[PDB]
Symmetry: D2
Subunit: 228 residues, 4 copies
């Protein structure tokens, strides 16, 4: 069964659990030198994010098999997740492909914005925009992080107009915050502590996207890069 | 100096030249089984594309040094180029960074559409976030291929309204076609023969983006996947 | 600063100025469904202890630490086969990139490479004897040598090996080790660069084997009782 | 030709009985040194890039595929000829393991064992016509399928002598994988069963291939120039 109850995560496998005291000190891995003074610790290293995404791709391929689907990348934060996912889905599909096979997925991009500093503004700005080509298609939303769940509730509501066949959700990180509205993903990488994360395409006011590991930003970082 | 004469390629290094008789048997490399019947030959393998992009990253870092710039990815065709470019630019910058360094680039996305089948429709569809956030910034346009030169000439005209400080162009492929209007990039990967190429994010009607190598689509493929 | 203390280690077994490894707790790890595991191995594994990507990221940092120590001084890397293969090739890849990225026209190559096959394990236990396939190491006379070893467990392999090296009149002997196990049987031999401290359980993957099996497993995992039984020598 | 009609595992070492042709690299093929990343200090000693790193890796993935299609699920033992085959061998293992383990099911088995032998014969850019051999006891290869993994066939002397040495061990089959074969008029006709590239008769360095222990860390296969041969002369 292809998931089609967005926010319910009806048949989702557990994520990897990153415990409240888990993580690694900054001297454990390569950290760009200028970023070190703004980070408290490494939560999830680049290579483990990548290994987990490979398995997610495998889970997605096991669900869709050869049914055409359309993957929708929420820019900008989902870039890292999306690129690793495309790499691993492609290799898994194409390694098992035979002469009578066909392409597994199409790729689409929507820019959505809602954060300022370390907080949801509670509003969602969307830029795409003709998603009518998605009518009657299976779509897989690819999102970097579910926090409040507000982005995904609002975007899923917004997708209703295009008369898409199914909407499934894949999300790299879910944060254990009391602010969460209950929105669950269908494929989920990691459950993480309630702290604002940066790295692997996740930014704090556009900073730290290029940081390879998922890290916690410290108060000096939040202060230095605050919105002005 | 930082380039600022879009289409002139005033100080550009030569690309790698791929001669008209260059390329490789489809049995030389891994090719997804179902695509083989639709391809003539491999032109540039994945790995050499990646090795060329690393050097282009290096070239870009040598020009900009530590001067902040903003990279504009032209979707969807530029995804593969842009992701490898980001990977290598980040490693090169962050490897040489020191505690007093800062981030080198910001990232932006513009969806730009003009082709149908193997030819330009001669019009250009543009969708992105509001580009006035680029005012007074150094901008680097990242494009997959210059063919007719129409996309870039029109897109650069359009950027004239935003009061950007400089506009430089990085292009992965330039096609030696008599249809070319003369638009030159500032950083260029490969010069290629006059044939419609697919793979490495370049499509024919949304097909073959997931193909890892740059290949020539054959007449059977053009017919099978024709717009209808 | 380098004028006050020469950074290249020269007290093998002492780990005189070693950074601490990443500490992996006994209850740390992941179930087998969290990552890619070859389907036929799953029945023989308890859990993933350290994922492949963590190991690779750690090794990049070790490369960095090694480059900071040796700077521009030529040294010779000595790979203890077969188990050190994964560690060693990751280490070379990263050392070469870090060195070659910062190199200038007047720079020079940083390291030579060398291989020795040494063997001591049967099943999950050291036999207490080290077999060395002798190879002509006199090319190491008066050179800085860095031994690259997958895992320190009892420490017997490395004490016996450093003893064998004495005859070659090497200039310095430093040790890099991917894993050190917190076994009560450890003789106290410490590495100069160490990746991870792990609990006292028999691990496989990332080139580490149980009787030649599991070297191709990408993640460091614990072999279970059924695996130990199935692949018993 | 189906597997019940002809057994695919090669067993006529030196004959390359059913080998796919290699990628052919022409004498005038290649790239300027500013085309790719080259360690700044090597550039004065190199003439051009002949085969870029990424091309080699992609080729090796296809060799892994070809090898997996041949052996299918039968256990074989890979024998890495040190030091020069390191690059080839580690890329080959990475891809072979992924191809095998991606298609593996619950009842599958491991595909290969790995073994190492140090062999040596070159001084400067020429074969010395003698071969030094160092390894573990290879009697563990008795009755096994073995695949020798070799960086480069040039005169073919290393491999004729090595295969002759192997005879004492009563191995079941001996197949050869080789990354480069050089079109040298000195070639004794020893052919590999799986071969990556055919290259012109010039001394190459990079991708683990050395000139007197130098250039192994160079990522791309390049030609060493005369200054390089002079500077790093034995
Ligand atoms: O913790 C976060 N970090 C970065 N972006 C986010 N968006 C929601 N939560 C986060
Ligand atoms: O050759 C091409 N292939 C794919 N897209 C293109 N856009 C311009 N030329 C091409
Ligand atoms: O735990 C281990 N696993 C594999 N090889 C080893 N050699 C010493 N300890 C170990
Ligand atoms: O051209 C070569 N380069 C390096 N090693 C070699 N061994 C035989 N030929 C060569
Ligand atoms: Mg967001
Ligand atoms: Mg954000
Ligand atoms: Mg276009
Ligand atoms: Mg297109
Ligand atoms: Mg062992
Ligand atoms: Mg040699």
């Amino acid at each position: 069964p292809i998931p089609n109850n967005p926010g319910a995560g009806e048949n989702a496998f557990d994520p990897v659990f990153v415990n409240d005291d888990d993580g690694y000190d900054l001297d454990s891995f390569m950290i760009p030198a200028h970023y070190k003074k703004y980070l408290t610790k490494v939560l999830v290293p680049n290579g483990v994010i990548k290994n987990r995404i490979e398995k997610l791709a495998y889970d997605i391929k096991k669900v869709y098999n050869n049914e055409e689907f359309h993957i929708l990348c929420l820019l900008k934060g989902s870039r890292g997740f999306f690129t690793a996912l495309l790499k691993h889905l492609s290799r898994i599909h194409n390694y098992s492909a035979v002469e009578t096979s066909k392409p597994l997925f199409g790729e689409h991009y929507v820019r959505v914005k809602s954060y300022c500093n370390d907080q949801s503004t509670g509003t969602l700005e969307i830029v795409s925009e003709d998603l009518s080509c998605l009518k009657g298609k299976h779509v897989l939303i690819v999102e970097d992080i579910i926090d409040t769940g507000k982005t995904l509730v609002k975007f899923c509501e917004y997708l209703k107009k295009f008369e898409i066949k199914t909407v499934a959700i894949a999300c790299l990180f879910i944060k254990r915050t009391p602010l969460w509205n209950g929105f669950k993903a269908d494929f989920v990488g990691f459950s993480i502590p309630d702290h604002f994360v940066v790295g692997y395409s996740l930014d704090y006011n556009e900073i730290f996207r290029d940081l390879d590991h998922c890290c916690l930003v410290n108060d000096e970082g939040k202060k230095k890069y605050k919105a002005t």
